[PDB]
Write a protein that binds this ligand. Structure first.
Ligand SMILES: *[C@@H]1O[C@H](CO)[C@@H](O[C@@H]2O[C@H](CO)[C@@H](O[C@@H]3O[C@H](CO[C@H]4O[C@H](CO[C@H]5O[C@H](CO)[C@@H](O)[C@H](O)[C@@H]5O)[C@@H](O)[C@H](O[C@H]5O[C@H](CO)[C@@H](O)[C@H](O)[C@@H]5O)[C@@H]4O)[C@@H](O)[C@H](O[C@H]4O[C@H](CO)[C@@H](O)[C@H](O)[C@@H]4O)[C@@H]3O)[C@H](O)[C@H]2NC(C)=O)[C@H](O)[C@H]1NC(C)=O
Ligand SMILES: *[C@@H]1O[C@H](CO)[C@@H](O[C@@H]2O[C@H](CO)[C@@H](O[C@@H]3O[C@H](CO[C@H]4O[C@H](CO)[C@@H](O)[C@H](O[C@H]5O[C@H](CO)[C@@H](O)[C@H](O)[C@@H]5O)[C@@H]4O)[C@@H](O)[C@H](O[C@H]4O[C@H](CO)[C@@H](O)[C@H](O)[C@@H]4O)[C@@H]3O)[C@H](O)[C@H]2NC(C)=O)[C@H](O)[C@H]1NC(C)=O
Ligand SMILES: *[C@@H]1O[C@H](CO)[C@@H](O[C@@H]2O[C@H](CO)[C@@H](O[C@@H]3O[C@H](CO[C@H]4O[C@H](CO)[C@@H](O)[C@H](O[C@H]5O[C@H](CO)[C@@H](O)[C@H](O)[C@@H]5O)[C@@H]4O)[C@@H](O)[C@H](O[C@H]4O[C@H](CO)[C@@H](O)[C@H](O)[C@@H]4O)[C@@H]3O)[C@H](O)[C@H]2NC(C)=O)[C@H](O)[C@H]1NC(C)=O
Ligand SMILES: *[C@@H]1O[C@H](CO)[C@@H](O[C@@H]2O[C@H](CO)[C@@H](O[C@@H]3O[C@H](CO[C@H]4O[C@H](CO)[C@@H](O)[C@H](O)[C@@H]4O)[C@@H](O)[C@H](O[C@H]4O[C@H](CO)[C@@H](O)[C@H](O)[C@@H]4O)[C@@H]3O)[C@H](O)[C@H]2NC(C)=O)[C@H](O)[C@H]1NC(C)=O
Ligand SMILES: *[C@@H]1O[C@H](CO)[C@@H](O[C@@H]2O[C@H](CO)[C@@H](O[C@@H]3O[C@H](CO[C@H]4O[C@H](CO)[C@@H](O)[C@H](O)[C@@H]4O)[C@@H](O)[C@H](O[C@H]4O[C@H](CO)[C@@H](O)[C@H](O)[C@@H]4O)[C@@H]3O)[C@H](O)[C@H]2NC(C)=O)[C@H](O)[C@H]1NC(C)=O
Ligand SMILES: CCCCCCCC/C=C\CCCCCCCC(=O)O[C@@H](COC(=O)CCCCCCCCCCCCCCC)COP(=O)([O-])OCC[N+](C)(C)C
Ligand SMILES: CCCCCCCC/C=C\CCCCCCCC(=O)O[C@@H](COC(=O)CCCCCCCCCCCCCCC)COP(=O)([O-])OCC[N+](C)(C)C
Ligand SMILES: CCCCCCCC/C=C\CCCCCCCC(=O)O[C@@H](COC(=O)CCCCCCCCCCCCCCC)COP(=O)([O-])OCC[N+](C)(C)C
Ligand SMILES: CC(C)CCC[C@@H](C)[C@H]1CC[C@H]2[C@@H]3CC=C4C[C@@H](O)CC[C@]4(C)[C@H]3CC[C@]12C
Ligand SMILES: CC(C)CCC[C@@H](C)[C@H]1CC[C@H]2[C@@H]3CC=C4C[C@@H](O)CC[C@]4(C)[C@H]3CC[C@]12C
Ligand SMILES: CC(C)CCC[C@@H](C)[C@H]1CC[C@H]2[C@@H]3CC=C4C[C@@H](O)CC[C@]4(C)[C@H]3CC[C@]12C
Ligand SMILES: CC(C)CCC[C@@H](C)[C@H]1CC[C@H]2[C@@H]3CC=C4C[C@@H](O)CC[C@]4(C)[C@H]3CC[C@]12C
Ligand SMILES: CC(=O)OCC[N+](C)(C)C
Lengths: 155, 268, 51, 283, 186, 216
């Protein structure tokens, strides 16, 4: 099969000791198929685009606040992840035994992108402060302009 | 080679419970009868042929097992996939490179690149439904779409780097000497380069010192403006190089994907 | 800018490590060596269980 | 088999072929039934007491023919059949309101980018590229409706691809105009050829205290003069970009209008041919 | 449910984005577009009867109304922010309410020889022009402070309404338990 | 009138090969039996009735055949379509007009308008899927969708015109007298807002005068 490879293929005669002899459920012969999915299609067409697009959101921290395009990038990444979730919702059953691995990654990436959008909002809020609106205390200056830049090895 | 693929589909027919020593089957003709064949709007049957096969197992030398296999070699008609799939992907690939000719000061590079990415993501919904879902090999059209996605994402990354470079100032950075030598001196020489690169009164005393303060302030501002202009020029040079590189990548990737199979089909 | 660089150095490794963990669960997911857990027989013609 | 070329403004020719499964023409033959007047009914019969009209498809013609073949001696016994040809015309009203008109309007929105300013807060690219995103959504829609054969291209798909190509070219045009308009003297050298073409040829075609204070004042005057000259050069670049936008708008309008008109006039001239048969349904 | 919660938090945080960033509209409207995508996602799963409305659909429409109101209120804030100081005079009641009373209750503290004759005339003109520039700056800052106060008020209002509505709907869903007995007495 | 539509679905029943002169069918009652009818979550049967008819066909000109036609007049319950389809369209339609309260200096007018258009485009797919490809009529929901679409298109066009007017440079374009007469004088009355000797010393003097004239 184009998507499944057979790993094991046993056969067994199953007899229920508790069932009566005159029951049809006493005996059966079962043939099992252990099959492994070949994930190349899903890899190429879903996972690499989705993972790359999700990782792309980290670029907003290297975007200057003067570009005026950070939150747009982040929310667009969230929209793309939503489209991927729409794509994946049509391919699996709506069962409750477990969250699929792709679903786990999509939820994780969406939570992280939401956090990134919030961080971008906070950073932009800090960037556009002026004397007429906010007061820049000396402790804030000492921390964020002399201490952390030295620790973070910024240019 | 999808959608420029050729298939070889067979129909093996035989008597299920009779062997060749009780019932013998022979072909009526060397080919299937196609005199009453309705035209297909998706496939062209290039060749058709029926072969009889007889198998004798070593255990039973007097009992042949017979079959007749009719095979059809068929060629897909690719116009539907060319129009609906390949051309939009080519348009997105072309649009990918245009960001590197957009100025940074426009404030719209991220808009262009991200919108191309969103269009490609929406186009994924057509791709997945119109592409085979097998894992024996990657479809050629799927290779092209993965190519386009990878290089639009690369364009976004490099555009973020370019925008970061454009906005650098002496208040945050100092130009390394290697950056100057590489981008302002050597590269433009292999490029067009048509681009630059009584008094005791406190009040009169205060006025004189103030006028000097204004003059010094704008001298410093002009120096910082020149440094920022150097950074912006470096960004523009990188943008021009990247425009050339990405347009070249678009053309060469499209050809390197399709031209092999298209030339193979032209020879036949 | 400083807050942005700190967020770059904190958020990105977290996402990288989380993605790596999630997909490494699946990459090394394999069917078991034997068809039936607790039963060592392979159920293959290479090991005929003669009487 | 569906001829897709003028879909959804298309007409089809569907056959209904009847034959005896068992008997050759010598054993069983066919004739058409005759009406109350004795006239041969060589067509699909329509009884007004037992007919319903399809909302999407109108039946214009429905002739019937009795074919005889393999009568030659080399073929053996003769064979016969009866073929009815339903010539049906789609009523495209649904596709016109629900798909074509929205697509045309949203595609035409791209022409508005020429009228937005070529500055930071102009949003030319934001209009044109998002029109290209809407057209991609329309592609997703249309893929669920058009036939999936490759003998020709449906008119709907041809129009969508055409407007997508036009939108892409207009995105490129917007990028070029933004590039030209936002050139600054500190990073771009004035081009006399482009300026002369765009702005001249083309409108025609169609004590130390005193000395140091004086030095500071002179420095301020020269700085103001340099700023004014730089602003002037920026103004020339902006004007050249405006002229380019002005002519490119007319070029894009002509291209869009002509291509759309040709594509849809292809549908206008696709009418059911004037056949010599009586109409299928009496009026 | 989780994407709806995330989009709702982003809708709340639009009210903390400064007007000068020029990004409130993009964030709010793309949040709305994402909610529309999830409406398409839910369209393939919900029952299609009309005797009642699913609670998840009520939650999804409540979130859509919240994001739409975020768009509307962000437009109002931007209108206040970019108000031209000279064409628009600040009404006295607007000043009193939004600059004096409301900021205290919202914990918003606002910080704080003919040649010589011609030279004198030019200097006086320049000083006068800078004076008018300062007055225009003061009026613009008053309008922008009003915009900031209104934005903070809407932030708190959105937090409160979101928390109350989400709590109500989630408690209504959570306490819907199966029957203890197959044949309850009605 | 979809989704507020009423339908009249018929069921014609008759003996195929027996005419009324050999086999006669009579209705058991004037109405279909609805005693065991299961309630529908999508339709309400307003009326139901069975009529007997005697019809002559072209196949059998002399023998009329009998039929009984049972018709049901049913009304759709529109709550599902109101909540799931109409309400988001109302939201986008209301957001359409707000671009004119959004200032030009924000630089976000086209973002809002085009994004509203994108949302309505994404919503057009549902309305496309929900109705037949029938030319007898345009559905009411389709009319509303088309109206909202044209509304957003017109809003975008007029917003582009407003943005063009806002950024009009003084140097390139002089204000026409008709514009100043209508928009600055006539119209603002109906509404209510405000209505709008070393050479170096000589060089320095000329420089100060130059600065003053430049700020002029
Ligand atoms: C698309 O796919 C299809 C497959 O689905 C593919 O079809 C193959 O087409 C090729 C032709 O290009 C076929 O090859 C030919 O097969 C002919 C028939 O072979 C069978 O019959 C032979 C005759 O049997 C009688 O006579 C012998 C004595 O001669 C006697 O012993 C028998 O009892 C009986 O009376 C028989 O010999 C032959 O057995 C051979 O093959 C089997 C299977 O591999 C093998 O087990 C045997 O040991 C033995 O080698 C078989 O049963 C055959 O006549 C024909 O031979 C001509 O060509 C060869 C070229 O090497 C010459 O050497 C020879 O002299 C002849 O000129 C040729 O071999 C092939 O069998 C088709 N496959 C199937 C499954 O249908 C298409 O080509 C594909 N299309 C593409 C790719 O375009
Ligand atoms: C793929 O899917 C198939 C099923 O479709 C899997 O096959 C199942 O594998 C498991 C593990 O190999 C089997 O369970 C084992 O069964 C044996 C035999 O038990 C039988 O005989 C007993 C003695 O007469 C009898 O008591 C058993 O019945 C009891 O258990 C069943 C459980 O369903 C219960 O219904 C009964 O009421 C009884 O209580 C049964 O008839 C057993 O020896 C194994 O023992 C394990 O568990 C005990 C604890 O219970 C523990 O002490 C042992 O050490 C050991 O761990 C075990 O229960 C199962 O029967 C198979 N099902 C079949 C064949 O239909 C297959 O494994 C899957 N492959 C994968 C996932 O790779
Ligand atoms: C799932 O869905 C099923 C239905 O498909 C539900 O089952 C229904 O549950 C309700 C409530 O539990 C039942 O109503 C109750 O019925 C009992 C028993 O009544 C029966 O036996 C009587 C013997 O004396 C007999 O008289 C009854 O006949 C009368 O009622 C029936 C009703 O169907 C009617 O058809 C007859 O013509 C008669 O009129 C009947 O055979 C009854 O004791 C209960 O009384 C309650 O209500 C009265 C109100 O006056 C009140 O006074 C009592 O104190 C008490 O509270 C009540 O009527 C109904 O019969 C079930 N239907 C079935 C079994 O088909 C099931 O509950 C659902 N599950 C859940 C969890 O929702
Ligand atoms: C809707 O669809 C139907 C069915 O497809 C069309 O009706 C057929 O139309 C074709 C033409 O397009 C007809 O084919 C032509 O028939 C002519 C008559 O010869 C036939 O009948 C005699 C009867 O004795 C037979 O002996 C003979 O074998 C044929 O069956 C031919 O003279 C025509 O010949 C031309 O084409 C052939 C190649 O096909 C050339 O070799 C010739 O040189 C010449 O150019 C032709 O074969 C066909 O008979 C029609 N079938 C019917 C009516 O049952 C409708 O026209 C179409 N409606 C539309 C499109 O509006
Ligand atoms: C949905 O669609 C169905 C059809 O599918 C409509 O059903 C029609 O309903 C009307 C009543 O409203 C029917 O009209 C009545 O028919 C009776 C029987 O007619 C047959 O039998 C007589 C006697 O043999 C023949 O003469 C006749 O030709 C028929 O073969 C008549 O007896 C009725 O007459 C009474 O009412 C009329 C009108 O008020 C009076 O003028 C008379 O004097 C008399 O009182 C009447 O004509 C009609 O036949 C039905 N059609 C079918 C095909 O069943 C539904 O009405 C429609 N629903 C809606 C709301 O649109
Ligand atoms: C820090 C960064 C942000 C964090 C991000 C973490 C992102 C999720 C990571 C994966 C969790 C999987 C999980 O076990 O979730 C559990 C809770 O599942 C829930 O209930 C969680 C979802 C809640 C949705 C919002 C509810 C709002 C009310 C359910 O798991 P399961 O379905 O029982 O099994 C899953 C598969 N497995 C069994 C192989 C593990
Ligand atoms: C598919 C069908 C529907 C498609 C959608 C609807 C149709 C859309 C298409 C076209 C129509 C809409 C035109 C809007 C014009 C607004 C006014 C305006 O800006 O005037 C302009 C001139 O404009 C002209 O010279 C007149 C343009 C009329 C075009 C008519 C074609 C129909 C002013 O030009 P400017 O002084 O240079 O200032 C702008 C500066 N800029 C060029 C840098 C931007
Ligand atoms: C769904 C809709 C949701 C709507 C919600 C309200 C926002 C839109 C409508 C009101 C905006 C205009 C307005 O009056 O704002 C005021 C500022 O103060 C405000 O911004 C008041 C509105 C914010 C909410 C106040 C509670 C400015 O008022 P004005 O225009 O200067 O008033 C002129 C008349 N006067 C001179 C008598 C004062
Ligand atoms: C950033 C780069 C690596 C792209 C992102 C790759 C992501 C999607 C990861 C997650 C799981 C990974 C797969 C897991 C297992 C294998 C091993 C082997 O069979 C070849 C590669 C293959 C099939 C991996 C390919 C890459 C993969 C699909
Ligand atoms: C970290 C980001 C890119 C997420 C995706 C990580 C993927 C690309 C990586 C993480 C660990 C990787 C696996 C680690 C080791 C092996 C064994 C060797 O035979 C190569 C394939 C395989 C099985 C790798 C496949 C790709 C893999 C699954
Ligand atoms: C890119 C722009 C210019 C055009 C967009 C519309 C495209 C899809 C159109 C333009 C010309 C068209 C082709 C013109 C003629 C033919 C020959 C015919 O026997 C089959 C269809 C075919 C091969 C058409 C396919 C669709 C086509 C390629
Ligand atoms: C209040 C706003 C902000 C949120 C979105 C509107 C929600 C709450 C509205 C829209 C339509 C409404 C439903 C319309 C009709 C019915 C049927 C009847 O049984 C009353 C409740 C019920 C089921 C309503 C419940 C509330 C509802 C789902
Ligand atoms: C006699 C016979 O079979 O007629 C069938 C057609 N009908 C039902 C309209 C009379």
């Amino acid at each position: 099969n184009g998507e499944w490879e057979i790993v094991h293929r046993p056969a067994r005669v199953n007899v229920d000791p508790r069932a009566p002899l005159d029951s049809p459920s006493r005996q059966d012969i079962t043939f099992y198929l252990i099959i492994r999915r070949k994930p190349l299609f899903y890899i190429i067409n879903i996972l690499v685009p989705c993972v790359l697009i999700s990782f792309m959101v980290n670029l907003v921290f290297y975007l200057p606040a003067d570009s005026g395009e950070k939150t747009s990038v982040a929310i667009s990444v969230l929209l793309a992840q939503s489209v991927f979730l729409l794509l994946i919702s049509k391919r699996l059953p709506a069962t409750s035994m477990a969250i699929p691995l792709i679903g786990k990654f999509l939820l994780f990436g969406m939570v992280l992108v939401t956090m990134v959008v919030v961080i971008c909002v906070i950073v932009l809020n800090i960037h556009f402060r002026t004397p007429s609106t906010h007061v820049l205390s000396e402790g804030v200056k000492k921390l964020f302009l002399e201490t952390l830049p030295e620790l973070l090895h910024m240019s | 080679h999808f959608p420029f693929d050729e298939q070889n589909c067979s129909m093996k027919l035989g008597t299920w419970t009779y062997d060749g020593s009780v019932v013998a089957i022979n072909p009526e003709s060397d080919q299937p009868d196609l005199s009453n064949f309705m035209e297909s709007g998706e496939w062209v049957i290039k060749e058709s042929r029926g072969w009889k096969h007889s198998v004798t197992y070593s255990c039973c030398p007097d009992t042949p097992y017979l079959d007749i296999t009719y095979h059809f070699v068929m060629q897909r008609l690719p116009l539907y996939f060319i129009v609906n799939v390949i051309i939009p992907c080519l348009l997105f690939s072309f649009l990918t490179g245009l960001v590197f000719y957009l100025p940074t000061d426009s404030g719209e590079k991220m808009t262009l690149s991200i919108s191309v990415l969103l269009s490609l993501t929406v186009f994924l919904l057509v791709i997945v439904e119109l592409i085979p879902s097998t894992s024996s090999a990657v479809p050629l059209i799927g290779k092209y779409m993965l190519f386009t996605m990878v290089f639009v994402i690369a364009s976004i990354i490099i555009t973020v780097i370019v925008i970061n470079t454009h906005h650098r100032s002496p208040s945050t950075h100092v130009m390394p000497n290697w950056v100057r030598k590489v981008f302002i001196d050597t590269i433009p020489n292999i490029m067009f380069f048509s681009t630059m690169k009584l008094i005791k009164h406190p009040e009169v005393k205060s006025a004189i010192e103030g006028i000097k303060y204004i003059a010094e302030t704008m001298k410093s501002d002009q120096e910082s403006n020149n440094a920022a202009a150097e950074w912006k020029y470096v960004a523009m040079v990188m943008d021009h190089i990247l425009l050339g590189v990405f347009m070249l990548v678009c053309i060469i990737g499209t050809l390197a994907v399709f031209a092999g199979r298209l030339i193979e089909l032209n020879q036949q | 800018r400083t807050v942005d660089r700190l967020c770059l150095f904190v958020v990105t490794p977290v996402m990288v490590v989380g993605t790596a963990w999630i997909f490494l669960q699946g990459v090394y997911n394999q069917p078991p060596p034997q068809p039936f857990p607790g039963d060592p027989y392979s159920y293959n013609v290479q090991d005929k269980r003669f009487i | 088999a569906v001829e897709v070329t003028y879909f959804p403004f298309d007409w089809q020719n569907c056959s209904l072929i009847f034959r005896s499964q068992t008997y050759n023409a010598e054993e069983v033959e066919f004739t058409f039934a005759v009406d109350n007047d004795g006239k041969t009914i060589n067509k699909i019969d329509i009884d007004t007491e037992a007919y319903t009209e399809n909302g999407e498809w109108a039946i214009d013609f429905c002739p019937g023919v009795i074919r005889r073949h393999h009568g030659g001696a080399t073929d053996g016994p003769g064979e016969t059949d009866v073929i009815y040809s339903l010539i049906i015309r789609r009523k495209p009203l649904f596709y016109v309101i629900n798909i074509i008109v929205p697509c045309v309007l949203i595609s035409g929105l791209v022409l508005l980018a020429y009228f937005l300013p070529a500055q930071a807060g102009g949003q030319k690219c934001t209009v044109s590229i998002n029109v290209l995103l809407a057209q991609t959504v329309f592609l997703f829609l249309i893929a669920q409706k058009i036939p999936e054969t490759s003998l020709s291209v449906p008119l709907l798909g041809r129009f969508l691809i055409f407007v997508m190509v036009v939108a892409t070219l207009i995105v490129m045009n917007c990028v070029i105009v933004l590039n030209v308009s936002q050139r600054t003297p500190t990073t771009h050298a004035m081009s006399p050829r482009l300026r002369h073409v765009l702005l001249e040829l083309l409108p025609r075609l169609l004590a130390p205290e005193v000395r140091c204070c004086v030095d500071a004042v002179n420095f301020v005057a020269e700085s103001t003069r340099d700023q004014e000259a730089t602003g002037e050069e920026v103004s020339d670049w902006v004007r050249m970009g405006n002229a380019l936008d002005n002519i490119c708008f007319w070029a894009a309008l002509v291209l869009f209008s002509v291509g759309s008109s040709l594509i849809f006039l292809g549908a206008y001239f696709n009418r059911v041919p004037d056949l010599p048969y009586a109409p299928c349904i009496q009026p | 449910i989780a994407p709806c919660i995330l989009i709702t938090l982003l809708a709340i945080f639009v009210f903390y984005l400064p007007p000068d960033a020029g990004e409130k509209m993009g964030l709010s409207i793309f949040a709305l577009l994402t909610l529309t995508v999830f409406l398409l996602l839910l369209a393939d799963k919900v029952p299609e009867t009309s005797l009642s409305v699913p609670i998840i659909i009520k939650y999804l429409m409540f979130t859509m109304v919240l994001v739409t109101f975020s768009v509307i209120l962000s437009v109002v804030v931007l209108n206040l922010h970019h108000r031209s100081p000279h064409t628009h005079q600040m009404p006295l009641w607007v000043r009193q309410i939004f600059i004096h009373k409301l900021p205290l209750y919202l914990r918003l503290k606002r910080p704080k020889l003919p040649e010589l004759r011609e030279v004198v005339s030019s200097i006086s003109y320049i000083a006068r022009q800078l004076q008018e520039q300062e007055d225009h700056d003061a009026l613009k800052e008053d309008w922008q402070f009003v915009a900031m106060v209104v934005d903070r008020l809407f932030l708190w209002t959105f937090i409160i309404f979101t928390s109350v509505g989400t709590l109500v709907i989630f408690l209504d869903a959570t306490y819907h338990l199966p029957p203890p007995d197959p044949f309850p007495s009605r």
